[PDB]
Point group: C3
Chain length 368, copies 3
């Protein structure tokens, strides 16, 4: 039977700490500098409390339902409170307990992205309800379908670190929220910087081992972020006449988001191109509305879609990628990327709508 | 002879950096948002300078006296300036130089906890004197008794990462201080977040290797912190009608502190329970006085005691723990936990009192 | 052929993230608290954009020219966009892709040191031009001469992590800048703290493996920083009557900088001595002018020179160092250290002057 490799154990535990750093305090500081001063304390409280909530639901049943073996949509309830997972149980080349924590840290950042933007306008009790509904019915199934051997994985979707699971998923949940409904830029810069650094655990850690794919994801992350910063800044200089700090940080997030599904499958040349496109598409995105912290979902959504589509192109050996699976044309992969994006957008939207309506019918959505 | 494992070397060096991050700037930012604005610069200076002081005393003689082989109370002076420790000397499965640094980082955070709270009211020269006295006569002996094969370890006390050595030890030193004698909440949140993230190096790193115990300590840390945030917040909502940012951060520290002695010995179920209890006991703790940054010692002390006692329960195989030693009943372990706590409280108190009185008799305690 | 060791891969990827953390947001926050409030946003934008620029130039041709095999001054253009570097290619004991990223992160911090100080007085377009010229003609050749088997390495210069490549190199580039031409101290402290923590990746990571040299560099880093904090603070107390936060942070950077070339070659005793000397020389340095963020180059330059010279002393086996190369007297090594420093100062100065003059002749240096 498979034995744990201590180097992979070490790597994956440090990567988990880096992903947790993205939420606490990464995303909290990012939104903290963006939202209105009088709402900062409240938002920091909601992000901290929902984070704690996600950590507990993850261990109680989330992990079991996302990663246990079940059907194409969800796992099982055989790993409740991690029951039946022996301490020395190995998953891949690391102890399963580490896989539990690494995966749980992705659920946290996903929920943090949503809560940080909406804390201002939503009642505390309504946010708790929403998180419970959406994590359970959207994050878990999509995580299972993509990384838990479910529907999307079974059709060969390529999503290295979560362009669908995390990015498009949360962007849609947030946009539905915004539909129903910067004071400190150094703070926004600091949150962006923390997100950037934690994103190396997020992207490289997604290899599940300290190998050449982790190395490739690492370098592609550095390259796409940089290329997206320049793309965004160039567009801003051309449209607005000068760059801005918010543009620079926005560009960084755009490349980070765009390279997320593609990092472990593409060559550096592809990372540079995905980065430039993500930086400009992000700028075009926010520009098309038509502001407030909800434009953040525009960037995550647009760049996530762009990243997911471009993964179906740049993964090709001919463009320096690791190569598509045997017997898979680029045309075929593209079609699977589009289908995965479509399923994600609709699954997340429906569940989000149900979550917001349930909260509204129970405690009232809008803050008192 | 034992050979160093590079994966453990890598893990332990990164964990040391994470523990150093807890002090610089973790604890400094935490207290910085809590104390009065006019005292921030001074406190940041005292924390930085005493930190430097601890780093030097550690290498000069601290490590030798804490970890050298001696008696039940202290080691020896054979490792002065790390003399006689060959560069390739292995301790456990890592180079001894790494053990020196990892252990020294625990001395730093312990002293930071005390200095950050008391900087406001104490004269600079008096704090330096106190640190010298208390690190040498309290931190070192207790570290030796618990982790250096001394008295407490010889009776089978369970303290994975320092509920006695760090937590109860510093809480008592601080409370004696307070006896003799929030302006920026985003800053308090940031310090809490940095402490949380560095605490994974602190807790998981305490395994001395990237194995399944490190994995277990990691997951228990995530779970207890989350459970303590919810416990504290629930109590606050029940007693005060609403949660607060300070309550959320306080809850986090309460679980972090409570899980400290227990993380490598308990199951996730036990971590969740210790977390809830620590969050409520922490709230009860500060509430019972009867405010200022010294309430911080109330949380570290109360939660440290609770953690240490509960370790003697939850370590049982029957409750999902790793199991007590052979021939040791739960009743026996509980008695040893109580004795360790009692010895710590008294040892730290006496030494602290001597330290404060010596400073007072030399330079004058209270700031001019 | 050489096979990658996963523990070294894990270590080096985490060390790269820590070095990237030094720039984003380390150096940006450090300068952010030092410069005038009205100039902060602009400086944060220039540091973010030039950082992105350096990341891209590094992958496009920087790495190839710095580390490819060429002559004594520069490498080659065989690794453009990392062409011809197989994904599984090993360099030392890690995948080459990791060496590319680790090395690129050093170029970033070097440029960040310069840009953060000069952003206030320089036109945005002029800074971009300057970075392009100076990275290509100064950073790259000096990196090649020292770490790329070039001129200096061929004569046995000792520079573990960059006293010449990074420190003296950027200090000179900045001083030429200043020649042609604190509002938030908690912010300066936070940036210093982040630089300190990231510096463990910088120094220990320079071993290229998680071995005993990485362990030694780690411990020497803790010791020299602490000793430099105390040295600086003692001098300040003696000259000014009391310590200050800025003095404490300055002392920390002085030891960090001074131990940079020496960390992997000296004993802890030597680290303590280099630390005290660097702290006092740094204080003497800034004092000798005759203020503004350009005094920062005084510290990096003076301490870098002191570190580089003292490396030629403390590396001796007799003083606890790892020992000079076979057949090399201390007198010989000292002469080689002086020659390396001299070449660096002149190479960087000339190139910097050319860079500033080219920018001035193209777009105008001084901000409009």
């Amino acid at each position: 039977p498979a034995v744990a490799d201590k180097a992979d154990n070490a790597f994956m535990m440090i990567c988990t700490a880096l992903v947790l750093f993205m939420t606490i305090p990464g995303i909290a500081l990012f939104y903290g500098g963006l939202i209105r001063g009088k709402n900062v304390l409240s938002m920091l409280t909601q992000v901290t409390v929902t984070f704690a909530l996600v950590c507990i639901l993850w261990v109680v049943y989330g992990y079991s339902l996302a990663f246990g073996e079940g059907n194409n949509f969800f796992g099982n309830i055989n790993w409740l409170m991690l029951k039946n997972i022996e301490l020395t149980a190995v998953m891949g080349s690391i102890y399963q307990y580490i896989h539990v924590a690494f995966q749980g840290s992705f659920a946290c950042i996903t929920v943090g992205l949503i809560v940080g933007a909406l804390a201002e306008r939503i009642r505390f009790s309504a946010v708790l309800i929403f998180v419970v509904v959406w994590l359970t019915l959207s994050y878990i199934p999509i995580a299972h379908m993509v990384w838990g051997g479910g529907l999307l994985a079974s059709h060969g979707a390529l999503d290295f670190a979560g362009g669908t699971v995390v990015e498009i998923n949360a962007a849609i949940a947030g946009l539905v929220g915004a539909y129903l409904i910067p004071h400190n830029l150094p703070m926004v810069f600091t949150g962006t910087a923390i997100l950037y650094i934690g994103w190396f655990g997020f992207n490289a850690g997604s290899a599940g081992t300290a190998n050449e794919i982790a190395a490739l994801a690492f370098v592609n992350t550095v390259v796409a972020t940089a290329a997206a910063i320049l793309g965004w800044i160039f567009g801003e200089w051309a449209l607005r006449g000068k760059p801005s700090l918010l543009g620079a940080c926005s560009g960084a997030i755009a490349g980070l988001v765009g390279v997320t599904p593609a990092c472990g499958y593409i060559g550096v040349g592809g990372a540079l191109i995905i980065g430039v496109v993500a930086g400009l598409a992000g700028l075009w995105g926010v520009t098309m509305l038509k502001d407030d912290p909800c434009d953040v979902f525009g960037v995550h959504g647009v760049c996530g879609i762009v990243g997911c589509i471009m993964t179906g192109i740049f993964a090709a050996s001919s463009l320096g990628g690791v190569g598509f699976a045997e017997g898979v044309t680029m045309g075929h992969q593209l079609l699977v990327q589009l289908e995965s994006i479509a399923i994600t957008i609709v699954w997340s939207g429906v569940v989000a709508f149900i979550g917001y309506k349930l909260a509204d019918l129970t405690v009232g959505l809008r803050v008192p």
